[PDB]
């Protein structure tokens, strides 16, 4: 089955509406619904809390203070504490101080507002400049990694370019909002939730209730999107549900409304990047000097590992002899930023892509040629390393870019625009190529383990269960395709179970694009074990070596005789051979020192390239993509179709982050963009009018599941292409350096045209 363009595990159930998400799920007539009461102050001591009108509001069955919580008031993924209900003080506008439990969802949302809270407000850290000046930061100082001596390279670099640019945040906008249901199954609880990470939900609920882990069970069939948001910010609702369930004796469900969701929960860390990049007269980089200022928010969340990935990807796609990052983990009284597709990679990589571009324009060289000249060497006695010193011997970017530019007709179109530009005076076209080098695996390396559990029933039909969770990436499809591949049976015969902590325990988050890689291996292990059992039994029963029992096309063959897979299982049942097996996998070769900034964090890297064409109106700044040409490397793809899709959407979302999506706070830490009306993700007509996504088909150098390559996060970084092309459009206006900022909204685009033109 592996390598077929088969459809998503629920594509029909999807398209007919019968796919059921948390809020869709049936439940008892007494199920109460919960709502958070949110702080309106950015940095205050709560000196008055009268929840009298809240309790008296109708439908209200229970209303909760931090003081009411029986155990651990913590949801943080970090060993650093983050309360669920505010403890004595508030740290950002939107912090849940209390929790209503009402007979209807509507009713609780109504009662949530009826609170009488008197705050004693303190000064508030809102901008990075403040945070940095007030020493409002995490980890106790910045992290500083250096390869060689940058200072010395830049001293005598033939060409050097310095700059400083803003990179805004990003809201997730998963169509299914954060959601959880608690069910008090006597003794312990059962949690159903729209979560990327069931096992931490287990951990967090367990602690909040005060019962050992074996009493909390988390089931998870699907999500309406995850993108990093559901990788932690589930804990809050799942704690809220289990704590209220425990207390009210009833089953308690909780789901945010879009308005709550954006206000309460954290987004993509906005960055500021200062770059000092230098080269020689030939074009080969002498070294780059980076400073990251990261907007982590009022709480740790996943800020630590996020900024580690940012620094790891600070090499973009290029070999640099001397590289230094100084990464600041700043705290502000805003939302606790979390994980998001790319997990910081996009941010560090964009700073390298802005530096390399600014250098190109400066020395008056074509960026594509300067990037081509500065890639990592293709494989096949000293292999180049990264700034963290990991050997890069799997880099196909030489070939890939050459492959893409030829197919995308890159040179003709860029010259074709030159003429189009000189004919126009109101509209300008732009075009840029962007490379992707993205390391695959968990930064924190012990999370690199995945588990499975496969049943084979007497009618032949198997039941699949792993630790990975479905958010739409088509994970189960790949698992089914692997499972059917290994047993030599039709993928029909493989059925997928909902993700369970009681089926596969001690899961990691379904994150870092690892999901398909490691679980694939996990599935394959259990399947091979079972397939071995059946083979051994046959070769005994049929007289011969198990090696010679071939399992294929739902048929078993041995001794020159053949049975259906069904017939062989029933017999091995009758023989009393176990048809249930677990499967486990832990990623090999991984070892690095975070604080040192040395070692091999990644098993391998995923590559790709994107050429984007755009138009800009010089008068207002209005913009749109016209064409996109992608050639992403998926290794030997587990599902060609599914992968191509991922790459399409990852790019659209990538570009969406650098274009129309913009997060805005007022002078009080109030998120002004807290609805779909004011946060503008890419809408239908925004799709690249000509959208060519092609795969790079070449087996992975490393021993991954069927030579595949984790395709989740990497193709997000293709969106850079559009931001660069938009800058290439601005460059066409005047002789000056535009200094385009992320996001490149019509206003921010005009402001770059304006600079190139030499105005204000």
């Amino acid at each position: 089955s592996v390598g077929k363009p088969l459809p998503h595990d629920s594509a029909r159930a999807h398209v007919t509406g019968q796919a059921r998400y948390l809020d869709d799920l049936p439940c008892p007539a007494n199920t109460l619904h919960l709502a958070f009461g949110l702080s309106t102050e950015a940095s205050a001591a709560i000196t008055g809390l009268d929840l009298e009108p809240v309790r008296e509001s109708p439908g209200v069955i229970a209303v909760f203070t931090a003081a009411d919580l029986p155990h651990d008031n913590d949801a943080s993924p970090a060993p650093s504490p983050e309360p669920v209900l505010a403890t004595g003080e508030v740290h950002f506008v939107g912090q849940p101080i209390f929790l209503v439990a009402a007979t209807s969802h509507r009713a609780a949302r109504i009662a949530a507002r009826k609170a009488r809270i008197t705050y004693a407000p303190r000064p508030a850290i809102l901008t990075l400049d403040q945070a940095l000046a007030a020493d409002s930061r995490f980890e106790g100082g910045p992290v500083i990694w250096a390869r060689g001596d940058v200072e010395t390279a830049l001293a005598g670099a033939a060409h050097l370019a310095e700059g400083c640019f803003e990179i805004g945040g990003q809201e997730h906008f998963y169509l299914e909002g954060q959601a959880a249901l608690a069910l008090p199954a006597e003794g312990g609880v059962v949690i159903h939730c729209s979560s990327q990470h069931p096992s931490e939900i287990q951990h967090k609920v367990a602690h909040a209730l005060g019962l050992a882990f074996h009493d909390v069970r988390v089931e998870m069939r699907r999500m309406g999107g995850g993108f990093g948001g559901k990788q932690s910010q589930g804990n809050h609702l799942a704690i809220a549900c289990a704590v209220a369930a425990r207390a009210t004796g009833r089953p308690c469900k909780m789901r945010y409304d879009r308005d709550d969701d954006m206000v309460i929960t954290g987004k993509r860390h906005d960055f500021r990047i200062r770059y000092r990049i230098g080269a020689d007269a030939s074009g080969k980089l002498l070294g780059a000097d980076f400073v990251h200022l990261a907007r982590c928010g009022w709480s740790a969340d996943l800020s630590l590992p996020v900024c580690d990935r940012a620094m790891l990807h600070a090499d973009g796609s290029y070999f640099v002899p001397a590289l230094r990052i100084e990464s600041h983990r700043l705290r502000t009284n805003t939302q606790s930023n979390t994980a998001f597709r790319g997990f910081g990679g996009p941010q560090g990589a964009l700073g390298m892509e802005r530096a390399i571009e600014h250098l190109a324009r400066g020395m008056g060289r074509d960026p594509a040629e300067l990037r081509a000249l500065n890639f990592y060497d293709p494989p096949e006695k000293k292999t180049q390393t990264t700034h963290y010193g990991q050997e890069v011997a799997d880099c196909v970017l030489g070939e890939l870019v050459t492959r893409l530019q030829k197919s995308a007709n890159f040179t003709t179109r860029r010259a074709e625009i030159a003429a189009w530009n000189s004919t126009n005076r109101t509209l300008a076209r732009g075009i840029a190529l962007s490379p992707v080098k993205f390391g695959i695996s968990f930064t924190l390396t012990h999370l690199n383990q995945a588990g499975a559990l496969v049943q084979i029933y007497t009618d032949g039909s198997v039941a699949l269960n792993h630790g990975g969770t479905e958010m739409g990436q088509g994970l189960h499809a790949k698992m089914v395709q692997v499972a059917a591949a290994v047993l030599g049976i039709d993928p029909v015969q493989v059925r997928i179970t909902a993700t369970d902590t009681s089926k596969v325990p001690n899961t990691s988050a379904t994150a870092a694009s690892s999901g398909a890689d490691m679980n694939g291996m996990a599935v394959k292990d259990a399947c091979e074990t079972l397939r071995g059992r059946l083979a051994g039994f046959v070769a005994a029963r049929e007289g011969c070596a198990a090696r010679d029992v071939i399992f294929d096309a739902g048929q078993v063959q041995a001794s020159g005789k053949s049975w259906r897979f069904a017939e062989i299982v029933a017999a091995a049942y009758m023989a009393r051979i176990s048809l249930s097996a677990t499967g486990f996998y832990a990623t090999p070769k991984l070892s690095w020192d975070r604080l040192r900034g040395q070692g091999r964090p990644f098993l391998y890297f995923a590559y790709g390239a994107a050429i984007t064409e755009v138009v800009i109106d010089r008068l207002t700044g209005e913009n749109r993509i016209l064409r996109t040409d992608i050639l992403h490397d998926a290794g030997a793809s587990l599902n060609p179709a599914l992968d191509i899709g991922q790459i399409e959407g990852a790019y659209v979302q990538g570009a969406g982050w650098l274009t129309t999506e913009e997060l805005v706070w007022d002078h009080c830490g109030r998120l002004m963009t807290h609805a779909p009306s004011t946060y503008k993700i890419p809408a239908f007509s925004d799709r690249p009018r000509i959208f060519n996504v092609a795969l790079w088909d070449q087996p992975n150098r490393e021993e991954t599941i069927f030579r595949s390559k984790a395709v989740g996060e990497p193709p997000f970084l293709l969106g850079i292409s559009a931001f660069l092309a938009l800058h290439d459009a601005c460059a066409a206006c005047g002789p000056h350096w535009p200094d385009l900022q992320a996001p490149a909204t019509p206003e921010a685009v005009l402001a770059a045209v304006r600079r190139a033109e030499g105005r204000a």
């Binding site: 459809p7 998503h8 629920s10 594509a11 029909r12 999807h14 398209v15 007919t16 509406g17 019968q18 998400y21 809020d23 869709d24 906008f173 169509l175 299914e176 909002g177 699907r222 309406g224 999107g225 409304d257 879009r258 308005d259 126009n424 005076r425 109101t426 509209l427 739409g472 990436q473 064409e613 138009v615 800009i616 109106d617 008068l619 209005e622 016209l626 179709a641 899709g645 399409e648 959407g649 979302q653 129309t660 913009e662 002004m672 779909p676 009306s677 503008k680 993700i681 890419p682 809408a683 239908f684 007509s685 925004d686 799709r687 690249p688 009018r689 909204t745 019509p746 206003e747 402001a751």
Partner: protein
């Protein structure tokens, strides 16, 4: 109170005891879990349902739709798109084949939205599916799907709904409305409900005394009069855009980008006007083409120019018992142009809305009608800039020479959608655009071919 309708083939009657309960509510409460929740603000079409009546089949957001509106209609939800025998709509299959699914959440919305397009044989998927948004796939798979599903014959079972039927006031005649609204001044009027329902779902507000104008055919009228065209306050934007196509290709072009197709089917012109928004996109167009409004205080009829209707912010020339009845726009307005500007093109609140319409007499500017949305807290015409342009040459430099007068006409605001500087700057930019476009320049960014 009782209303009946056709829910997915079955004939259903319902007892209205709460008139303001949305249709999204009703369905999910009833069990129709296939319709989903995305925000209850209309922006993401996760709940696009299909309705049908004497007019034809239309795609709407169930979260903006109050039950007493679907009275007498034919409703089709996602769980009822496929054939009763079990066969999938050509849309459902094409979407399976062309992988229009990843997380599956927005899928019900699109299916319903595409199905209604498929039924009415519509193909402008760009504008048509602009309502329901998806985070996951990048729309390209959906666009392939919709084109493949296009070739297949219409769903004959969905077609069968056409034959159907052929406490909270619901009028049937415009008189009967003025009649009732004469005695109930403090009554919450619901036309399309695309702004009133955001007070109930988001702002959580209770409103006794309600009247659905969405059942007064004589209030929703296109009628030709000697002077021009008499558009009734009940006319829906989709239809207003559809009617403009001929006489006003410029107004249609703006109305293209008015909300989504979902909201355009139910949102009305007189609703948008009587709403009284400064970031309202209806007025500036109508005000730049000098269209007279019409009010009714029972048997009373006032008829002022639309600019006069808006005095202060949130304060309008409405009298207790008075309501918007119709608007009157003259036959032709060849010099009119409308410029909407926002972060994203489709379905967004415009930061600046530039409406310009002059006459020539060779080269000299005759009558200038320059009007703006979002520039000051009320849709008003730019006087100082306008007075400067009249009786002057229609060249770039002269128009550039009076641009600073707009900074005396308005002093814009600075929210999350634009900094005053840029809002002001783009306002000026729209005037240069107008002189360029009219001289035959390539100015439109949306019109550029890849």
């Amino acid at each position: 109170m009782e209303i009946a309708f056709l829910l997915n083939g079955e004939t259903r009657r319902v007892r209205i005891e709460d008139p303001t309960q949305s249709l999204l509510e009703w369905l999910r409460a009833e069990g129709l879990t296939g319709t989903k929740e995305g925000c209850n603000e209309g922006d993401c079409g996760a709940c696009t349902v299909m309705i049908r009546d004497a007019a034809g089949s239309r795609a709407v957001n169930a979260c903006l739709m109050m039950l007493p509106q679907i009275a007498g209609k034919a409703l089709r939800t996602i769980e009822g798109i496929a054939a009763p025998d079990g066969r999938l709509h050509p849309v459902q299959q094409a979407m399976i084949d062309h992988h229009g699914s990843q997380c599956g959440f927005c899928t019900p919305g699109f299916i319903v939205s595409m199905a209604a397009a498929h039924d009415r044989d519509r193909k402008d998927y760009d504008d048509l599916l602009a309502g329901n948004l998806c985070r996951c796939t990048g729309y390209a798979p959906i666009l392939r799907a919709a084109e493949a599903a296009a070739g297949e014959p219409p769903a004959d079972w969905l077609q069968a709904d056409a034959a159907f039927t052929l406490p909270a006031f619901l009028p049937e005649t415009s008189d009967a409305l003025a009649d009732w609204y004469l005695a109930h001044p403090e009554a919450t009027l619901i036309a399309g409900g695309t702004d009133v329902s955001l007070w109930v779902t988001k702002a959580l507000r209770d409103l006794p005394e309600v009247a659905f104008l969405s059942h007064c055919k004589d209030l929703a009228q296109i009628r030709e009069t000697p002077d021009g065209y008499g558009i009734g306050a009940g006319v829906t934007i989709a239809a207003l855009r559809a009617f403009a196509e001929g006489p006003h290709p410029a107004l249609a072009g703006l109305l293209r980008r008015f909300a989504s197709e979902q909201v355009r089917q139910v949102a009305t012109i007189g609703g948008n006007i009587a709403n009284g928004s400064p970031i309202g996109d209806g007025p500036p167009a109508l005000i730049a083409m000098g269209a007279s409004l019409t009010l009714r205080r029972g048997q009373e009829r006032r008829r002022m120019p639309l600019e006069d209707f808006f005095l202060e912010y949130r304060k309008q020339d409405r009298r207790p018992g008075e309501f918007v009845e119709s608007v009157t726009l003259p036959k032709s307005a060849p010099g009119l142009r409308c410029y909407k500007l926002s972060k994203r093109f489709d379905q967004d609140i415009s930061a600046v809305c530039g409406c310009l319409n002059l006459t020539l007499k060779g080269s000299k500017i005759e009558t200038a009608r320059i009007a703006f949305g979002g520039m000051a807290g009320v849709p008003k015409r730019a006087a100082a800039f306008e007075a400067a342009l009249i009786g002057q040459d229609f060249r770039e430099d002269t128009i550039a020479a009076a641009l600073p007068l707009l900074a005396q006409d308005f002093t814009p605001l600075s929210d999350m959608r634009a900094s005053a500087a840029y809002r002001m700057n783009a306002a000026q930019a729209m005037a240069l655009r107008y002189v360029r476009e009219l001289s035959g320049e390539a100015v439109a960014v949306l019109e550029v071919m890849p």
